[PDB]
Amino acid sequence: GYDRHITIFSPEGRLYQVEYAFKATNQTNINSLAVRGKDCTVVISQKKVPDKLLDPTTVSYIFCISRTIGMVVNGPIPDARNAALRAKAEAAEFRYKYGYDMPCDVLAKRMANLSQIYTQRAYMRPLGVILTFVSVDEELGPSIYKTDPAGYYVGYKATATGPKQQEITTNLENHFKKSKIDHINEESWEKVVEFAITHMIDALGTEFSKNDLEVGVATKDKFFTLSAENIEERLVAIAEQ
Amino acid sequence: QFNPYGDNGGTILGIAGEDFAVLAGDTRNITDYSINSRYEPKVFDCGDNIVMSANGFAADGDALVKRFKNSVKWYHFDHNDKKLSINSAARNIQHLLYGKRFFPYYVHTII
Amino acid sequence: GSRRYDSRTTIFSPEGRLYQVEYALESISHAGTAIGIMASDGIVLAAERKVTSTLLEQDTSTEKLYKLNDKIAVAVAGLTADAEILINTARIHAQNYLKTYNEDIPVEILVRRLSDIKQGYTQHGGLRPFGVSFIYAGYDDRYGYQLYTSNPSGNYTGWKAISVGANTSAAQTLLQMDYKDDMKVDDAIELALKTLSKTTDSSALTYDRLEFATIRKGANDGEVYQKIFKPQEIKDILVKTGIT
Amino acid sequence: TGYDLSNSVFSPDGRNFQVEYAVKAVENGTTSIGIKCNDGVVFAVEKLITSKLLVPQKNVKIQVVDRHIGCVYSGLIPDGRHLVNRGREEAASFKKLYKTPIPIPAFADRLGQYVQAHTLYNSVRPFGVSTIFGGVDKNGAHLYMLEPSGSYWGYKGAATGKGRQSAKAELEKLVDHHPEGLSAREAVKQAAKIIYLAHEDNKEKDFELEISWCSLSETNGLHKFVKGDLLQEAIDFAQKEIN
Amino acid sequence: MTDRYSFSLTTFSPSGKLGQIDYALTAVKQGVTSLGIKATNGVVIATEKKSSSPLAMSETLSKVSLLTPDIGAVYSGMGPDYRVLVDKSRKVAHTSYKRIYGEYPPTKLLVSEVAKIMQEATQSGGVRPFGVSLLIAGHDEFNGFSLYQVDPSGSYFPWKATAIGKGSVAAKTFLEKRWNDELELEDAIHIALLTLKESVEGEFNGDTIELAIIGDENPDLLGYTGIPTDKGPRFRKLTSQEINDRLEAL
Amino acid sequence: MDIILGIRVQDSVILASSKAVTRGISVLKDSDDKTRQLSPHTLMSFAGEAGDTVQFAEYIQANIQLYSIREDYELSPQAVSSFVRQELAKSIRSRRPYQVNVLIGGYDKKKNKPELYQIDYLGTKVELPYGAHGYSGFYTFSLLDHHYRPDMTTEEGLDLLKLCVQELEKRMPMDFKGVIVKIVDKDGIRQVDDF
Amino acid sequence: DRGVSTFSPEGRLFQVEYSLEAIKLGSTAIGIATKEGVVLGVEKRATSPLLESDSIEKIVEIDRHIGCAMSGLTADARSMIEHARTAAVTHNLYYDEDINVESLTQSVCDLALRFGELMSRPFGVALLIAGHDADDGYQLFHAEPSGTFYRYNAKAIGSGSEGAQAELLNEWHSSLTLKEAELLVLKILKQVMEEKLDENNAQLSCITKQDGFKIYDNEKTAELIKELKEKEAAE
Amino acid sequence: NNYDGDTVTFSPTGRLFQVEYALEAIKQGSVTVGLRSNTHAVLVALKRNADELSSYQKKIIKCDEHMGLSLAGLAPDARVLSNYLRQQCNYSSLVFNRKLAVERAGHLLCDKAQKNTQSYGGRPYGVGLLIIGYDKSGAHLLEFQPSGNVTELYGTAIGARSQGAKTYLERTLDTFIKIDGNPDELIKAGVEAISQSLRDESLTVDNLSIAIVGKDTPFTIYDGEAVAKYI
Amino acid sequence: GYDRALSIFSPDGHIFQVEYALEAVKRGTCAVGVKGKNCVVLGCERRSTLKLQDTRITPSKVSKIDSHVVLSFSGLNADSRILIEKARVEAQSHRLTLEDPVTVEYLTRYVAGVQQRYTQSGGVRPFGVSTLIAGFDPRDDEPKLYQTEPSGIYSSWSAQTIGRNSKTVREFLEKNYDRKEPPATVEECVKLTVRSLLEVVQTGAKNIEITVVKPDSDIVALSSEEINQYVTQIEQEKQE
Ligand SMILES: [Cl-]
Ligand SMILES: [Mg+2]
Secondary structure, three states, X not given: OHHHOOOOOOOOOOOHHXXXXXXXXXXHOOOEEEEEXXXXXXXXXXXXXXXXXXXXXXXXXXXXXXXXXXXXXXXXXXXXXXXXXXXXXXXXXXXXXXXXXXXXXXXXXXXXXHHHHHHHEOOOOOOOOEEEEEEEEOOOEEEEEEEOOOOOEEEEOEEEEOOOHHHHHHHHHHHHHHXXXXXXXXXXXXXXXXXXXXXXXXXXXXXXXXXXXXXXXXXXXXXXXXXXXXXXXXXXXXXXX | OOOOOOOOOOOEEEEEOOOOEEEEEOOOXXXXXXXXXXXXXXXXXXXXXXXXEEEEOHHHHHHHHHHHXXXXXXXXXXXXXXXXXXXHHHHHHHHHHHOOOOOOOOEEEXX | OHHHHOOOOOOEOOOOOEHHHHHHHHHHOOOOOEXXXXXXXXXXXXXXXXXXXXXXXXXXXXXXXXXXXXXEEEEEEEOHHHHHHHHHHHHHHHHHHHHXXXXXXXXXXXXXXXXXXXXHHHHEOOOOOOOEEEEEEEEEOOOEEEEEEEOOOOOEEEEOEXXXXXXXXXXXXXXXXXXXXXXXXXXXXXXXXXXXXXXXXXXXXXXXXXXXXXXXXXXOOOOOEEEEOOHHHHHHHHHHOOOO | OOOOOOOXXXXXXXXXXXXXXXXXXXXXXXXXXXXXXXOEEEEEEEEEOOOOOEOOOOOOOOEEEOOOEEEEEEEOHHHHHHHHHHHHHHHHHHHHHHOOOOOHHHHHHHHHHXXXXXXXXXXXXXXXXXXXXXXXXXXXXXXXXXXXOOOEEEEOEEEEOOOHHHHHHHHHHHHHHOOOOOOHHHHHXXXXXXXXXXXXXXXXXXXXXXXXXXXOOOOOOOEEEOOHHHHHHHHHHHHHHHO | OOOOOOOEOOOEOOOOOEHHHHHHHHHHHHOOOEEEEEOOOOEEEEEEOOOOOOOEEOOOOOOOEEEEOOEEEEEEEOHHHHHHHHHHHHHHHHHHHHHHHOOOOOHHHHHHHHHHHHHHHHHOEOEOOOOEEEEEEEEEOOOXXXXXXXXXXXXXXXXXXXXXXXXXXXXXXXXXHHXXXXXXXXXXXXXXXXXXXXXXXXXXXXXXXXXXXXXXXXXXHOOOOOOOOOOOOOEEEOOHHHHHHHHHOO | OOOEEEEEOOOEEEXXXXXXXXXXXXXXXXXXXXXXXXXXXXXXXXXXXXXXXXHHHHHHHHHHHHHHHHHOOOOOHHHHHHHHXXXXXXXXXXXXXXXXXXXEEEEEOOOOEEEEEEEOOOOOEEEOOEEEEHHHHHHHHHHXXXXXXXXXXXXXXXXXXXXXXXXXXXXXXXXXXXXXXXXXXXXXXXXXXXX | OOOOOOEOOOOOEHHHHHHHHHHHHOOOEEEEEOOOOXXXXXXXXXXXXXXXXXXXXXXXXXEOOEEXXXXXXXXHHHHHHHHHHHHHHHHHHHHOOOOOHHHHHHHHHHHHOOEXXXXXXXXXXXXXXXXEEOOOEEEEEEEOOOOOEEEEOEEEEOXXXXXXXXXXXXXXXXXXXXXXXXXXHHHHHHHHOOOOOOOOOEEEEEEEOOOEXXXXXXXXXXHHHHHHHHHHHOO | OOOOOOOXXXXXXXXXXXXXXXXXXXXXXXXXXXXXXXXXXXXXXXXXEOOOOEOEOOOEEEEEOOEEEEEEEOHHHHHHHHHHHHHHHHHHHHHHOOOOOHHHHHHXXXXXXXXXXXXXXXXXXXXXXXEEXXXXXXEEEEXXXXXXXXXXXXXXXXXXXXXXXXXXXXXXXXXXXXXXXXXXXXXXXXXXXXXXXXXXXXXXXXXXXXXXXXXXXXXXXXXXXXXXXXX | OOOOOOXXXXXXXXXXXXXXXXXXXXXXXXXXXXXXXXXXXXXXXXXXXXXXXXXXXXXXXXXXXXXXXXXXXXXXXXXXXXXXXXXXXXXXXXXXXXOOOOOHHHHHHHHHHHHHHOOOOOOEOOOOEXXXXXXXXXXXXXXEEEEEOOOOOEEEEOEEEEOOOHHHHHHHHXXXXXXXXXXXXHHHHHHXXXXXXXXXXXXXXXXXXXXXXXXXXXXXXXXXXXXXXXXXXXXXXXXX
8 A cells, every 4th residue: 555655646545645744733732723803913822841951941843934934844854954045945935036025825725735736746755744823914814724734725714723723623613603703802022922922822721831832923024922921921911811 | 477387407218128127317406596405306116116206397297297196095995906007008098188279388397 | 666657568478479568459449349340432431429428518619520621531439539639640741741742642652651650669769659540541543442450569451341449349340241342332221221220238339439531533523522410411311221 | 564674764653663773773782871960961972992912092083073063973983983974074164154163953953954954865875873962162062962853852861772761860960969069070970970870781791991071261261171180080999889 | 066957757668648638637536526607708717625634724825826817727636736837827828928928828828838838747848747737718819718738748729618527427417408608607607616516515505616707808807007008907716705795695 | 981972863872982091191091981871772972070970870770770670671762861860950959069061862662753852060951953062063963964864774873973073173172083883773772883 | 686796695696607607608619728829719509500600799809919709608708808909909009019918808898897777787798818939929818797817728618628638637737839729629529519519619729939829720720620530539 | 774775864863874775894804914013014815815826916916115904895995095195195195295195195085085975966986994003103904984984993893703803913912013023924824813803714825915114124015935934 | 776687597597588488479470481593482370360350451471671671480578669769770770870770680689689689778678579680681682581579589491481380381391492403593581482382371361471582672472363373383283
């Protein structure tokens, strides 16, 4: 059964290497979440540092692709960094060739097309990662676009990824049924981050310290990650309410 | 425009006897009307009882001698330390020089 | 490395056969039958469309019969997509010959080159062969009217009347029975249709399941005309011979 | 099955068995460690003395990249050398274009991408080494450990090879007992001790100690080998602690 | 390193089957239903927007794509394979036609170029076939309106009307009863919505249905005025509102 | 090289080509045949740059002979001339072009007609009743405009050709050491030995 | 299947070892080196009586001072000879001298291992290279598809090799004349050959300093065959 | 078993079998010994013959005036690697006017052998080498293995029954290291060392092969009647 | 480029791909070559399961390489075209540089070299073809007949056959062909060639092709009636 080793069709029209790359996604056992505000797009992810000898500042699955675009990965770090470096190079080249900053959705498409090639060409394996791209696009506003090993991509009102993704997904679904809108009706990004963390706490059922989370925030003209103290300030605000 | 050749002057002289041979050359090196060195040798022992000199443009002369000395070394490696005869050395030098037929070594060579 | 997944398409069996060529011929034997018949004053090309649907646009369709130049046409049996690669190559080769010599290409030369391409895919490159058999129908001023066939092996031969695709065994027996050398085009038209009508896997042979073409000298004085039959023209020729 | 016969093939788990097999070759190799300190990093390695016929001090395993980075590895020694040769090319092109010497995090990714590239195709084999490396740059001291998969992180302390668990346990004690920081000269002495303690998992053949270090104060930010009086002082400290 | 797969991954089996093409067709069978209907004064192509999650914005994912101003495309099967084919199809319309003749290609020839790309994935080294079937609707001056199907093998056929994917067998039967040669465009849109309701299970509205037409020229969608010969694109994607209007009088 | 002439008459094509091969101030040879038989009923004469002429002529000859063997069939003079033109048309935009002018005289066995083609080094082909390359044309064209008739015999064509050679020997500056004459007709190619 | 350049568990290249089996199936070739010259002899082995035996070219000239005999898949030897001839002439062009027999052999043996995934497989033919130079005198070399070559005083290759080599072991001494060596090759060939030895199914050749490399006529070999039979009956 | 088809495949225990099978070719090869003092370095090689009619396979190769090796295993692979060493030694001379350090020579061989063990299509080298040399830091002896592993030693031996000579040198270490300014005595110690690896056969005149390099001695090889002194 | 070593050695020292190519030759229609005192004759079988053929345009079994040399074959027909083309090109190339047409030995040696190259080149299979090459050297009246095969070996033959049932016709030729006295005339040589094919063929109608080559580029193919006369004559003498 060599049709399960390379990316060719099985008798039932399936690509097993693609399906097994999807299973590699959860190898890190980390759950991510992304939501949109009025002026911003917030992405949060769990941070697990098991070894005491590790330098916790270097342990990260959120990446600054361009000034405006941010990316969180669900999957092994080697493949994550492979995708991150390529996205950075693509975003930089786009600006040079076409004279304006690469949109979040266009970069998502480009990375998805690259992922598609690995599903069709035999010598290249798929990357075992799911890439969630976030920005405040100058045309489309707050944006969340997500890519997987199949080469599939789509825009999102909000999204979640990881082992306990479905619990987070339905938690968010129920909120948008209630609110009757496509986003978090909130002025400051600080309270959108608070919303993101609060709803992850409810869905996963766990409490978080400052070192258990990792937060990325996209505003107009810049994407940035929060420090441990920026998150701690945010956790205090939730607790006092 | 850049001129890749120069003239380092000097002169050389070879004479053959019955059971010996001499290869002489002056030790002066020049450019235009200036002396560069009063003692810069240009007659070299290349091994296997072969002496060589490539007079004219010293850069090309040194390059050629260097390549021939190296040719002698590889002749030993490839042919079981056989002595390179003077006639065989001469033919080897022809191919070295003619290899640059369209961008020559500006030298008059004597062995 | 990648050796593990190599099918080795261009090798011999212990018996001295080319696996992939033999299997490609097995593929072609399920394709719609195509017949070529050569007369003294023209050539007939007839071909059966593969199980037609009622909602298929019949008039603006091309599956079996293709034009290579003004003097040469082919009938296809096998993978259509594969045939179209080879057809565009053949069309180019004909124009190269015309550009070079200022003369229309002789039929055999075009056939040989197209057959040589197929041969290459069986000897080198490690790729699968083209799953296609052609019937070539053409005219030149050297040999006049000519019929050829080529198959995935890259071997070609000349014919007076020939079939490719499905039921060739039955079709060739019927052609061998009723064919003769002093035959006219109109007689050959009738033979081609009668043969398909008996060898068809369908219940009854109709206009919508056929492609038809003739190469006559029926133009005005010493010149050749290609006629790719329209749907209504096939309907009329089917009634005229008394099949429907 | 057969999922483990070819590199770059995902198993039904989502694992690349060929990379995991390369890790076994690393686990088989000799012990090597890295210790991050106040203003730099310290590297140390176990050299098994196979025979009396080995010339002492003349089979050097720790390698320098550029003038400020040190690299040490456990597993297939040739594979490690190939990785350092690449590292040197990467560091040379960085300096050529950008003038400044390559930062340690930048350098870490250059190796990381190159090792990761050897898990993408079946025409290449994964690296049979875990590489501990680091140095001093504009932002201070950095220590890194890189694995056959291409996975790397920053470390306070790092260890790999046959005696990794013993060395990790000893490293974890240093992190707990010295929260404010460990000095460079101390880290050299501790490194010696940890190699000697980690030698208990490889005690048939006796060994030779080898230590190097980068420090902003002690070595002026450049990579140097520990030799002579400072080496013997570190050996004596380690000898006193085992007894 | 380097692509060592220079050999075919699609080969003939002893029975004469090309396995990877058959298996690609099986992947198309699993895919969501799409269809196309040809009228006298236009063509309609339609499909269901299967949403992966309710949090996902299905507007951002476009199953029906413009290829040229007068040609559109829809698919059934693997979406990523379709997306790259649309990219390649758009580019080939320029490189192999518009940059030569100064005008857009006719439907049949663009289809022929797409087919060629899909055939090469069936024979070239180190690649699998595309796991999609395309339906390409278009118009050009000399051929009028036309509708084509393109399969993983690279074979293509012209259709009066057809369907592909999940419930294609039932959908084709439905179209045979309703189709005639005198259908106006609005009648064909009506039939398309009826046919598609059979295969769709959940919600059936303008937000879950994607539908586009090849009809009259649209001067309002051109973007400029002043050139009389340039009259606008015949391809138009129907809005969510425009679909719901026709669902009331269904 | 220098003088090559051609005359197409009723039933044949006659090619006259100078015998002199000069380099510098020395006539190196006075019996040089500036022609190659491409096929039994097709002859090509040539003139131009030294070396290029023979190299080109023999290259064309090889290709036509290869075609003849492959198809077991002789190419028409029209077909051979078109092939030759295309080769020169390629050549002119090469790194180093063939500086060779040619006349192709042939008898078409299918049409039963003689044919004369004049092709220059640029790839400029023309079918003509009479042709010439180089300075020769400046005398022979006007002469033939006057004396040529389309229905002439081979013997009349040879006398017409003698009239051209006499004029060239009288008014040309260089000694071209006479000409080799060859006739192309239904029976093939033959050489006139006494001219 | 498996790689072309793969090692066996015993530490040998599979393809090289299998090519050695092909050489054992080949026709017998014998070489003997003396101080008066080197003799080369081969079994022609015509597959049918209709085949014109004089067209069987299994002894070959490389240069005037170097000859060559083959055994195994003899078609494979053509490119090896072509390379040898070019190497010999090229060296004479570059150095105005004859090329050493050892240096020639080494150049041929460099082709041997230039196979893998360069050509697709090793050569299926062994060569006996015989020659003379001023330095090391009369020499005989055995060149294999492994890339290895040994110098020999005498050597047999082909189907009757192990039997002939044991016979050469006893018969060879350092004072053999050329005439003695000619008869010895004929004697040993007749022992190992299937069909009866004559001038048409066996060929002799030699290389001497004075006359260079010479293939013997069928008339000359016939007299040596007749001289051999008389001498064996004489005691 | 299933993981020895090519060099690009690791076994489940982390082994490269094609490299180990290449290592096996060395064990089948004829014995060769290397040893050095502070002033000189010596190679001693037992040559092997096909039969009594054949010559004895030459084991020692010169690389430069100050460096050379002995081989054990596939001789053509030794020719490729020695040729590479000749070029690298020569590159160092022409470009930098610098004799190539014996340590760098080892590093270059290691890196050349390694590339063959990580790529598809190629194979490992099937030969082991003993490199001796005299450079700016005195006498040197290296042991090359086709896995890539190069090792600097006082003395060693490779080939069939090399363990006998290697044990002897391990005992004699203190004696032969201090044979300074005496070539013949250092060779004698090497000839006595290789004798510990002999079985049934003894050292004859056309069987033994010795090479030496040192302070005022270029790399020179001794064969034939020149080695009769040491039997 | 496709690199795979398809032709490789096996444990017993055989190259199976080359040996399987010989089986393709054994499947092919019979071809025979007989050389006389002043001529060579090439006879070829044509299988009679194919009726409704057009013999005007169907590729002939004997191919002219130059005006003085001919090539017949047994095995894969498509493969043979490639060898014939290459040979024809080399024939014109030899005329161009050496100013002399090829010898029969040289042409054979070239064709044989091409066949050999395909047995140790990556990505290719051997030619499933054996050839009989016959003719006369320039300015020479001595007849030449050579044979090649997929492995690349070639040799000269007084008379030889290849293809299906070739071992039967070789048996016939081995007793009927005298080395001391070959067929003195053209008639004698053609008759012996036809006789040898009649052991194998079936009927002597449109199943046998005969091509006669004589010195100085004198090559002619016999028609049906001309061949049928030999068939009629042989059968009447047989009934005895
Ligand atoms: Cl893209
Ligand atoms: Mg002109």
